[PDB]
């Protein structure tokens, strides 16, 4: 729960960095916006890893 | 202490009470009958432990 | 000199061993690729005295006769080989295992050891080594002008050179699986060696018949559960208390016999 | 004096090392061209007692014998060589690297150190120097009558004099790259010197076989991430407190025994 | 590990001193702003000093 | 009058010596340039009784005979001559060493002592003295109306005068290095004198021959690490308690002998 | 009554002196032209026991003998004579120093 | 370790010091075998896994090998004679001292920065003190009983 | 009881005097012909453990 | 009795520690140095592999 | 110091001592820290004098 | 050790002192041969492993 929560914290930070990069490039000719895709990291099926 | 080496072996003999007689100086010696059968000098017994 | 004192001494030693195991588990919390250990005890000999089941009388037998037991002894410490939670260190050379495999390294003596920790570096010549400088086998040679190292899920190590749109494969990282994983001899330094109780090392590709998947940028932290360790510390302390009290009680009894 | 005490005395020291690394990283959150550290740990001795895999009977082996272990030791603190974010502070004397190369600087004793800090100044004699006063190599002199300094993406330093429509080339800045960037020995003042684990210094031009690119008016900031250091402090503090609790439990156990 | 953090606190204080001095001279003819540069104090590697 | 009493008395004395060293280390937390101490212990004599290796039979030997040992005694006290953490005191008169050098000062008796403490003052005559008033060597004298004192990384001390655009040199702060730094005899006042076990005093400038670099405005704090001292206090207390229990057991044994 | 107790007693006294210095520095924040104090300590005497460098055998010397030390003592309290921040009170009689002089 | 008289002793206490002429010696001043001389220009001394001692001097980017730490292995360890100050001498029960590199021929490894502590188990010794004390109190009572029996016998 | 405690209590009282002066200055903003106060502090006694 | 040799993932068998069993163990002759010798009331020393 | 022999002297002879006694109780006449009681009548001394 | 009559005796009591003309003597005052004379400006006397 301190490694499953850290993973979610880092994922949210990555998403926010992507959003900030999209905002900063509002006026940039030829720029394409970016989005982040997340996937779970299950192991056994009863033990989630974040 | 590596120098420790054997030097000599003490002579240990086996004699019962009926074979030895206390001489006048307190030292036991073989009786006549016992001496005649066991010889003049008693051979060392290898089974004696000290 | 008295039996109860030997029994209580054995109990004290067993509890001290349990505390030592607990302290070792708690000392390796930050170690990557560490597995927590648990000790298992067995009771000592049983004095026969009156053989149970003997004929108590011509037509009757003794049910559960007089057996006097000795203390306790520890059988063995078993590891818990389970997947610890992954941590993202965002490093191109850190590798974590998702399944049940091990990395193989060569000791300076020429023998082969096995480690699960994936914190890898590169030496002055270019080969992939562990933190202790031991060379990961099968030898993976990273060339001088590398821009990025990519390690896939199936163990292929690729290097992307400058101006070339295709990546150059420079090795193949395999995983070794043993029938009995807990039977390995731990030499420290996050290294386990094969014993006769750990079967034989079966090499396999990471994704095949049961080797795990390799994740790049991830490290496998220890599986030590700390709240369990605190509760077990409480338990061990109380058990040591009770065994010491048994020793003290035996001490008080022998005193009265001395006084007699 | 007792085993668990030594093990928990190694746990304390390892966690203190982790806190030292975290605090040093947080203290240098603003220094340009900084690479943050990561401490790695490994298991200490493992007392054999009953050998794992020992032949108990003539046909039955003992699986996973009584392997009581010792505490933990840290292998080393490794530098996480990643590209820090570039900042546009708009001065002609600030240059930032985009790849994985290093600037070469000549130490006063005649040896050469390597730095990734791009904040350059000009001494009284007109040479490019590091902010600590160490002269850069292979020496780029700047005339007194200079109007503008232009350092291109290839490291060419040009100076435009008064009333002249063409720039004058005053040198060529080169980047040094190593086989292993981690093995360099840090000597402070944002300076690293060569070690035998870092291979040999390969000098290269900025854009060719693997040296990075130089951007003028830019400074390379540190790669330290504050939030991750905060979370790591919270976890190191808890681990240190729990290991101290293990120390206290051992102390209490030794008290009752002595009192007996 | 106390001196290491104290040094970082002092560096942040110096940065904020420079920022405050720059702000106070927002309207001051002939003023050139200041900027503080920092360098680590590594002793022999593997340990930091601040 | 009984062997065990003398042995346990020696043990008590050794533990008291360990506690003395611990207290000395703890009392000097705030001392600049202080080095922590460690005690080394050795076994005392060994009563031989049976000679190990003697001839028990004509073809057998006596393995590991009856050696009875005496108590324990401290061998020696060793310092940990390592770099302490630096502290910024923002004073132009305070100098810190980054390597392994010593400042040479002159005692009032004319002999030279060596100190690593950099808290310097200027006397009424202008000579750079230490906090106790001992004159550094050489007499780095200072002019009357100095505005600022600049001590470089290589020991060059300069003074900036008024109306003069160039700094004037008023001395050269040098460092003394020894073959064995642990062999220097401590005399208090943060002063070490030469012995025959500390080699010879090698005078050198800061930056060459290994001697350290000088930082102006910083002081070298003590290297005492508190957590080790606390764990060692626990160790000392419990070992002292065990040895006192052994003394008490010997006392009860002797008393039982007296009653009969 | 025992050596370690005296050493710890000296350490306590030194830390108390440091606390007094800090308290004095705090009490004079609002004073004009005040220079803060800083205390410097030195390590006390050493009980010699075995002398470091004493010739044990005919040829081998004893390195780093048993130098058991005593506590600590404060040498001095030094002022930091540095230019404090100047404050404008707009008074015709208040004067401030820019350098390193003193009024008599 | 080489003793002043020239005979070699053996120690497991790994706390070493450099003497005034370089030279690694034990804390008692006895020189360790074989010879390692550390120069003045040394910045840091590293002792490897296999006992190789490397010294880093200023300027050189490559460490300079100085000496080799050779471990002496006995086949019967307990047969050594404890000569006092953390030293054991070979006897007829521990003959043939085999010099070897650490890690080879069954020899152990070297960890630098760590010292092996005593292996004395504390609870065992306390329980053993309890047993010894009560045992000395039951033998003393046997002495007293024999004394009383003799006094009663010789009184008549 | 302790020198540090007395020094800190004295510093507290001095800062309280400064606060009272500031409050009295603020309370008389609208008064005509008022002159605001300012407090001047000084160092107290200096014990000579070792004479400079 | 098996020993571990360096680099050999397998133990080397050295020997078997056999136990001698007597019929009337109480009839043995205690000769001193923690040794018993066979006496006519404790005859027939049967060597055996322990456990069998 | 007595002549133990015809040519030697006795060093450090047999002195058996009795217990311990208190010599004197001395006062430390130093300047205590000042406390301000906001009283027009309380006076404090700065040097080394006494009120009569 | 040198007796008053001039013949040499032997002792194992290692409690030695020094008399007023330098010189090591026993607790009884007899002088030890060989003759070892400690000077007056001595700061510390070390007796080594080999009797130096």
PDB file of C-alpha atoms in Angstrom, chain F residues 16-17 19-21 23-32 34-35 37 39-40 42 73-79 89-91 94 117 119-121 131-132 145-147 162 180 182-190 192 195-197 219, chain G residues 2-5 7-12 14-15 18 36 38-56 59-73 75-82 100:
ATOM      1  CA  UNK F  16      34.001   1.113  31.859  1.00  0.00           C
ATOM      2  CA  UNK F  17      36.765   2.096  29.424  1.00  0.00           C
ATOM      3  CA  UNK F  19      31.802   3.864  28.312  1.00  0.00           C
ATOM      4  CA  UNK F  20      34.529   6.462  28.931  1.00  0.00           C
ATOM      5  CA  UNK F  21      35.334   6.539  25.212  1.00  0.00           C
ATOM      6  CA  UNK F  23      31.163   9.731  26.808  1.00  0.00           C
ATOM      7  CA  UNK F  24      34.223  11.489  25.394  1.00  0.00           C
ATOM      8  CA  UNK F  25      32.807  11.102  21.883  1.00  0.00           C
ATOM      9  CA  UNK F  26      29.386  12.385  22.966  1.00  0.00           C
ATOM     10  CA  UNK F  27      30.723  15.409  24.876  1.00  0.00           C
ATOM     11  CA  UNK F  28      32.529  16.637  21.733  1.00  0.00           C
ATOM     12  CA  UNK F  29      29.603  16.859  19.295  1.00  0.00           C
ATOM     13  CA  UNK F  30      30.029  20.627  18.847  1.00  0.00           C
ATOM     14  CA  UNK F  31      33.841  20.572  18.715  1.00  0.00           C
ATOM     15  CA  UNK F  32      35.221  21.606  15.331  1.00  0.00           C
ATOM     16  CA  UNK F  34      37.147  16.388  16.283  1.00  0.00           C
ATOM     17  CA  UNK F  35      37.726  12.716  15.484  1.00  0.00           C
ATOM     18  CA  UNK F  37      37.630   7.312  19.238  1.00  0.00           C
ATOM     19  CA  UNK F  39      38.759   0.997  21.734  1.00  0.00           C
ATOM     20  CA  UNK F  40      40.415  -2.274  20.693  1.00  0.00           C
ATOM     21  CA  UNK F  42      42.585  -8.324  23.345  1.00  0.00           C
ATOM     22  CA  UNK F  73      42.359  -5.610  28.358  1.00  0.00           C
ATOM     23  CA  UNK F  74      42.103  -2.718  25.867  1.00  0.00           C
ATOM     24  CA  UNK F  75      44.824  -2.780  23.215  1.00  0.00           C
ATOM     25  CA  UNK F  76      44.659   0.827  22.057  1.00  0.00           C
ATOM     26  CA  UNK F  77      42.448   3.750  21.086  1.00  0.00           C
ATOM     27  CA  UNK F  78      42.194   4.464  17.352  1.00  0.00           C
ATOM     28  CA  UNK F  79      40.701   7.570  15.770  1.00  0.00           C
ATOM     29  CA  UNK F  89      29.910  30.120   9.485  1.00  0.00           C
ATOM     30  CA  UNK F  90      30.179  32.967   6.970  1.00  0.00           C
ATOM     31  CA  UNK F  91      33.432  34.194   8.543  1.00  0.00           C
ATOM     32  CA  UNK F  94      37.528  30.418   9.373  1.00  0.00           C
ATOM     33  CA  UNK F 117      40.470  23.235  13.734  1.00  0.00           C
ATOM     34  CA  UNK F 119      38.537  28.827  13.851  1.00  0.00           C
ATOM     35  CA  UNK F 120      41.204  31.537  13.600  1.00  0.00           C
ATOM     36  CA  UNK F 121      41.425  35.049  15.037  1.00  0.00           C
ATOM     37  CA  UNK F 131      41.119  30.414  19.279  1.00  0.00           C
ATOM     38  CA  UNK F 132      43.563  29.787  22.138  1.00  0.00           C
ATOM     39  CA  UNK F 145      43.483  48.483   7.786  1.00  0.00           C
ATOM     40  CA  UNK F 146      42.451  45.362   5.857  1.00  0.00           C
ATOM     41  CA  UNK F 147      39.073  45.406   4.137  1.00  0.00           C
ATOM     42  CA  UNK F 162      41.806  50.662  -0.087  1.00  0.00           C
ATOM     43  CA  UNK F 180      50.255   7.848  10.194  1.00  0.00           C
ATOM     44  CA  UNK F 182      46.356   8.013  14.106  1.00  0.00           C
ATOM     45  CA  UNK F 183      49.789   8.042  15.751  1.00  0.00           C
ATOM     46  CA  UNK F 184      49.698  11.750  16.607  1.00  0.00           C
ATOM     47  CA  UNK F 185      49.504  12.300  20.357  1.00  0.00           C
ATOM     48  CA  UNK F 186      46.447  14.284  21.429  1.00  0.00           C
ATOM     49  CA  UNK F 187      47.222  16.889  24.102  1.00  0.00           C
ATOM     50  CA  UNK F 188      43.839  18.608  24.302  1.00  0.00           C
ATOM     51  CA  UNK F 189      42.978  22.071  23.002  1.00  0.00           C
ATOM     52  CA  UNK F 190      42.361  20.315  19.664  1.00  0.00           C
ATOM     53  CA  UNK F 192      48.190  16.915  18.220  1.00  0.00           C
ATOM     54  CA  UNK F 195      55.429  11.060  17.919  1.00  0.00           C
ATOM     55  CA  UNK F 196      57.740   8.389  16.509  1.00  0.00           C
ATOM     56  CA  UNK F 197      54.715   6.375  15.345  1.00  0.00           C
ATOM     57  CA  UNK F 219      34.517  24.885   9.465  1.00  0.00           C
TER      58      UNK F 219
ATOM     59  CA  UNK G   2      33.427   8.190  37.865  1.00  0.00           C
ATOM     60  CA  UNK G   3      35.244   9.412  34.765  1.00  0.00           C
ATOM     61  CA  UNK G   4      32.391   9.027  32.271  1.00  0.00           C
ATOM     62  CA  UNK G   5      30.074  10.955  34.604  1.00  0.00           C
ATOM     63  CA  UNK G   7      32.860  13.809  30.924  1.00  0.00           C
ATOM     64  CA  UNK G   8      29.086  13.836  30.443  1.00  0.00           C
ATOM     65  CA  UNK G   9      28.756  16.607  33.072  1.00  0.00           C
ATOM     66  CA  UNK G  10      31.218  18.741  31.064  1.00  0.00           C
ATOM     67  CA  UNK G  11      29.303  18.011  27.866  1.00  0.00           C
ATOM     68  CA  UNK G  12      26.054  19.089  29.522  1.00  0.00           C
ATOM     69  CA  UNK G  14      29.019  23.078  27.240  1.00  0.00           C
ATOM     70  CA  UNK G  15      25.636  22.487  25.608  1.00  0.00           C
ATOM     71  CA  UNK G  18      25.650  27.058  23.754  1.00  0.00           C
ATOM     72  CA  UNK G  36      25.740  38.085  17.408  1.00  0.00           C
ATOM     73  CA  UNK G  38      29.221  32.325  18.695  1.00  0.00           C
ATOM     74  CA  UNK G  39      30.876  29.944  21.156  1.00  0.00           C
ATOM     75  CA  UNK G  40      33.940  27.848  20.302  1.00  0.00           C
ATOM     76  CA  UNK G  41      34.814  24.672  22.220  1.00  0.00           C
ATOM     77  CA  UNK G  42      37.987  22.649  22.713  1.00  0.00           C
ATOM     78  CA  UNK G  43      38.498  19.059  23.793  1.00  0.00           C
ATOM     79  CA  UNK G  44      39.888  18.585  27.303  1.00  0.00           C
ATOM     80  CA  UNK G  45      42.866  16.652  28.665  1.00  0.00           C
ATOM     81  CA  UNK G  46      43.784  13.044  27.859  1.00  0.00           C
ATOM     82  CA  UNK G  47      44.588  10.240  30.283  1.00  0.00           C
ATOM     83  CA  UNK G  48      47.656   8.610  28.774  1.00  0.00           C
ATOM     84  CA  UNK G  49      47.665   4.934  29.852  1.00  0.00           C
ATOM     85  CA  UNK G  50      49.844   3.398  27.133  1.00  0.00           C
ATOM     86  CA  UNK G  51      51.843   6.095  25.371  1.00  0.00           C
ATOM     87  CA  UNK G  52      51.252   6.332  21.589  1.00  0.00           C
ATOM     88  CA  UNK G  53      54.535   5.498  19.894  1.00  0.00           C
ATOM     89  CA  UNK G  54      56.096   3.798  22.893  1.00  0.00           C
ATOM     90  CA  UNK G  55      58.631   1.122  21.967  1.00  0.00           C
ATOM     91  CA  UNK G  56      56.969  -2.186  22.825  1.00  0.00           C
ATOM     92  CA  UNK G  59      62.107  -2.720  17.160  1.00  0.00           C
ATOM     93  CA  UNK G  60      58.283  -2.489  16.925  1.00  0.00           C
ATOM     94  CA  UNK G  61      56.521   0.650  18.147  1.00  0.00           C
ATOM     95  CA  UNK G  62      52.977   0.827  19.509  1.00  0.00           C
ATOM     96  CA  UNK G  63      50.689   2.828  17.160  1.00  0.00           C
ATOM     97  CA  UNK G  64      47.909   4.998  18.600  1.00  0.00           C
ATOM     98  CA  UNK G  65      47.981   4.045  22.287  1.00  0.00           C
ATOM     99  CA  UNK G  66      45.119   4.203  24.775  1.00  0.00           C
ATOM    100  CA  UNK G  67      44.379   7.931  24.790  1.00  0.00           C
ATOM    101  CA  UNK G  68      41.262   8.099  26.939  1.00  0.00           C
ATOM    102  CA  UNK G  69      40.065  11.683  26.847  1.00  0.00           C
ATOM    103  CA  UNK G  70      38.185  13.949  29.231  1.00  0.00           C
ATOM    104  CA  UNK G  71      35.198  16.166  28.253  1.00  0.00           C
ATOM    105  CA  UNK G  72      35.008  19.519  26.498  1.00  0.00           C
ATOM    106  CA  UNK G  73      35.516  23.168  27.465  1.00  0.00           C
ATOM    107  CA  UNK G  75      37.406  28.583  24.775  1.00  0.00           C
ATOM    108  CA  UNK G  76      35.791  31.803  23.635  1.00  0.00           C
ATOM    109  CA  UNK G  77      32.709  33.711  22.580  1.00  0.00           C
ATOM    110  CA  UNK G  78      33.407  35.609  19.354  1.00  0.00           C
ATOM    111  CA  UNK G  79      31.296  38.361  17.823  1.00  0.00           C
ATOM    112  CA  UNK G  80      30.465  38.425  14.116  1.00  0.00           C
ATOM    113  CA  UNK G  81      31.315  42.021  13.201  1.00  0.00           C
ATOM    114  CA  UNK G  82      29.426  42.162   9.902  1.00  0.00           C
ATOM    115  CA  UNK G 100      34.044  48.987  10.359  1.00  0.00           C
TER     116      UNK G 100
END
